[PDB]
Design a protein around this ligand. Structure first.
Ligand SMILES: CN(C)[C@H]1CCN(C(=O)[C@H](CNC(=O)c2ccc(Cl)s2)NS(=O)(=O)c2cccc(N3CCCCC3=O)c2OC(F)F)C1
Ligand SMILES: *[C@@H]1O[C@H](CO)[C@@H](O)[C@H](O)[C@H]1NC(C)=O
Ligand code: NA
Ligand code: NA
Lengths: 27, 10, 250
């Protein structure tokens, strides 16, 4: 149930350096 | 090249 | 990974290194899908043209890693294999069709800041995300060039390519169980998986529920990062009936 949620990122609401590049491609 | 891992895993 | 960058700490906590016991070396990438199951490419375990046919006792799985060669004491976890399961219709003779395998660990791995499973897609996740132009992420400790080796885990974001473009880039027969990704020569951006990255994950972050899903498995490429070539990935959703059958049965 907790799959795909990273302790050091999603769980702390911190984004990694390039995930925004993925989001921008999801038009 | 690879650092030796503890014996227990081998 | 060619033309990638160093991963941040805990950026890919589902990353798994397949490690040969003797001689001690990196064999492939892989991914953590539960506390006892690891997903990889079938060719990482069975490839008769290269005299490769591994048994459980030949290998180790190293989870929570960042450094390629260093033993990351108190961070990484080294696991033994209970059983390897290769797709019964994996086509090693021709095109690596159904290039997938599961490995069951002898004991569950404890989750931490550095160790956490990735999601597997359902039909709706696959339909939503597996679209040309949409980018996924590939990670691994493989070669930095076709013709050295990285100090730490590498990351690259790559767009999924239209099926006709994938087909037209190769003489190999491409099936519905594969997809391809990477930049076109005219895009002015580069990057690819390479030797040593095979079996690792191609992941996407769902914008609907903000979870990471493993859409592909690094399968093959004609060399690495060549202009007009693309990386080929096992279509994880297309093989979900088999994944579920194995996890349900054993
Ligand atoms: C093929 N399996 C067993 C492993 C062994 C080496 N592999 C390769 O694809 C190599 C190196 N490049 C890569 O690994 C990757 C590049 C991009 C992705 Cl994605 S993976 N590319 S290669 O050029 O040197 C190569 C070497 C040996 C075998 C192959 N393949 C793979 C496709 C089907 C038939 C074949 O002979 C092959 O790929 C080529 F056909 F496309 C994966
Ligand atoms: C792989 O090895 C096993 C024994 O460990 C053997 O039964 C099997 O036939 C081998 N497969 C191939 C294709 O060589
Ligand atoms: Na073709
Ligand atoms: Na290319």
């Amino acid at each position: 149930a907790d799959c795909g949620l990273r302790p050091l990122f999603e769980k702390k609401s911190l984004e990694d350096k390039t995930e925004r590049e993925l989001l921008e491609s999801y038009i | 090249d690879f650092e030796e891992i503890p014996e227990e895993y081998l | 990974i060619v033309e990638g960058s160093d991963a941040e700490i805990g950026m890919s906590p589902w990353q798994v290194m397949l490690f040969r016991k003797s001689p001690q070396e990196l064999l492939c990438g892989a991914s953590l899908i539960s506390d006892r199951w690891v997903l990889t490419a079938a060719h990482c375990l069975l490839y008769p043209p290269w005299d490769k046919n591994f048994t459980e006792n030949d290998l180790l799985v190293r989870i929570g890693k960042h450094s390629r060669t260093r033993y990351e004491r108190n961070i990484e976890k080294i696991s033994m294999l209970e059983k390897i399961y290769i797709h019964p219709r994996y086509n090693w003779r021709e095109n690596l069709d159904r290039d997938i395998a599961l490995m069951k660990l002898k004991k569950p791995v404890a989750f931490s800041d550095y160790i956490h499973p990735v999601c597997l897609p359902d039909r709706e996740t696959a339909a939503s995300l597996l679209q040309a132009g949409y980018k996924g992420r590939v990670t691994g400790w493989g070669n930095l060039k076709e013709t050295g080796q990285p100090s730490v885990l590498q990351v690259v974001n790559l767009p999924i390519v239209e099926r006709p473009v994938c087909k037209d880039s190769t003489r190999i027969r491409i099936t519905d169980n594969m997809f391809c990704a990477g930049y076109k020569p005219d895009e002015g951006k580069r990057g690819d998986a390479c030797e040593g990255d095979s079996g690792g994950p191609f992941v996407m972050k769902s914008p609907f529920n903000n979870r990471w899903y493993q859409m592909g498995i690094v399968s093959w490429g004609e060399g690495c990062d060549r202009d007009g070539k693309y990386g080929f990935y096992t279509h994880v959703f297309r093989l979900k009936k088999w994944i579920q059958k194995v996890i349900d049965q054993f």
